[PDB]
Homo-oligomer: A and B are copies of this chain.
Amino acid sequence: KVFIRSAINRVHQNSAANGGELPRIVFPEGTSTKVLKALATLVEEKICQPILLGYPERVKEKIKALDIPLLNDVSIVHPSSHPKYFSFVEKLYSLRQRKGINLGRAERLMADPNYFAAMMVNQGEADGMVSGSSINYADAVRPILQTIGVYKEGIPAGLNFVLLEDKFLVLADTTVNLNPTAEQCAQIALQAAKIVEYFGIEPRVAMLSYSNFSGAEGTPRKMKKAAEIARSLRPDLMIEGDMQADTAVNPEIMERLFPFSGLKGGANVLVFPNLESSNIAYKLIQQIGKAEVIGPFLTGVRRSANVLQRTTTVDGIVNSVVFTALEAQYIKEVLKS
């Protein structure tokens, strides 16, 4: 409620500090009913320049079918017909020619809106992309990781916000790594923490397990080791584990049962031991928890690109576009430095 309006306003503060320019967000699924309805609400709010990918004739005919006159302008680009199509094909080929992709396969991949979108963002023809409403997560994210890639020492990891009364929680990694090592969960925590700091909040990080400070072999030792590695890398942050999820979020359970712990006031960063636990958790909270859940957002990647969960609603997509715009604005300012 409040959190999403506040992000929208920060987009505007960012934009009025850069000559009124809006980030350009490319959408591979120019024909998606859910994407188009979401774009209707966000064009009224001046959050981004949408670019739709597809056949101009298909896309315009879907726009009027759904009766949304506010999209009669939005840029529409057909990948094969774009002037840069050949340049993009050659650059994908050069990236993948020793990873089993011949030239003709590079052409057919670059004709796919998902690859064309990722290459547009990589080449500065757009500032970000939002994809994945119509296809599964692996299919949508592979072009991004193949084309944009991860920044140095970074790790691709999905991140979700749980919006509670007077507080948000950050959950990660909800989408990418099946079974991260201790070193990977430490890095996932570091990425999640800098996101929390961007919002003016102190990150307090819990490495989750089924155990409370046992350190037994398997995930308890892994999450205990992840906390130690992370604490070494950010000695200023509260980072703790291994601990159970209720121990983590509830400060009264922590202090009563584990008062030696370095984590006071409840964790707002929840790093998971495997993909089963992160993925089932955010989805169950979203369905039954009666709290808004936004994301997942792809962290660790060089440019702003987020893959929607296939189960997303229209309002989900709205929320994801807003934060993709913020991400796009922030990355463009680091690159100016």
Residues of A within 8 A of B (CB): 94, 97-100, 102, 104-105, 108, 112, 134-136, 139, 162, 164, 169, 178, 208-216, 218-219, 224, 244-247, 249-250, 253, 257-258, 260, 270, 272-281, 283-291, 309-311
* A133 to B, closest residue via Cβ: B104
| Chain B neighbourhood of A224, CB < 8 A | 98
Question: With A and B bound together, what is the CA distance between A272 and B274 in angstroms?
Answer: 13
Give the distance to chain B from A294, nearest Cβ to Cβ, in Å: 14
| Chain B neighbourhood of A211, CB < 8 A | 100, 136
Question: With A and B bound together, what is the CA distance between A276 and B243 in angstroms?
Answer: 11
A218 touches B257 (CB 8 A): no
Which of A260, A272, A309, A311 has the most C-beta atoms of chain B within 10 angstroms of its own C-beta?
A311
What number of copies of this chain does the assembly contain?
6
B286 touches A289 (CB 8 A): no
| Chain B neighbourhood of A287, CB < 8 A | 245-246, 249-250
B288 touches A210 (CB 8 A): no
B280 touches A289 (CB 8 A): no
A214 touches B139 (CB 8 A): no
| Chain B neighbourhood of A283, CB < 8 A | 244-246
* A289 to B, closest residue via Cβ: B289
| Chain B neighbourhood of A135, CB < 8 A | 102, 104-105
Select which of B247, B274, B290 is within 8 A of A276 by beta carbon.
B274
Select which of B94, B213, B279 is within 8 A of A244 by beta carbon.
B279
What are 5 A-B contacts defined by CB distance under 8 Å?
Answer: A210-B276, A212-B310, A244-B283, A276-B277, A289-B290
| Chain B neighbourhood of A277, CB < 8 A | 274, 276-277, 280-281
Top 9 nearest A-B pairs by Cβ distance?
Answer: A100-B214, A289-B289, A210-B279, A245-B283, A277-B277, A246-B283, A276-B277, A290-B290, A245-B280
Select which of B246, B280, B289, B311 is within 8 A of A257 by beta carbon.
B311
Give the distance to chain B from A83, nearest Cβ to Cβ, in Å: 20
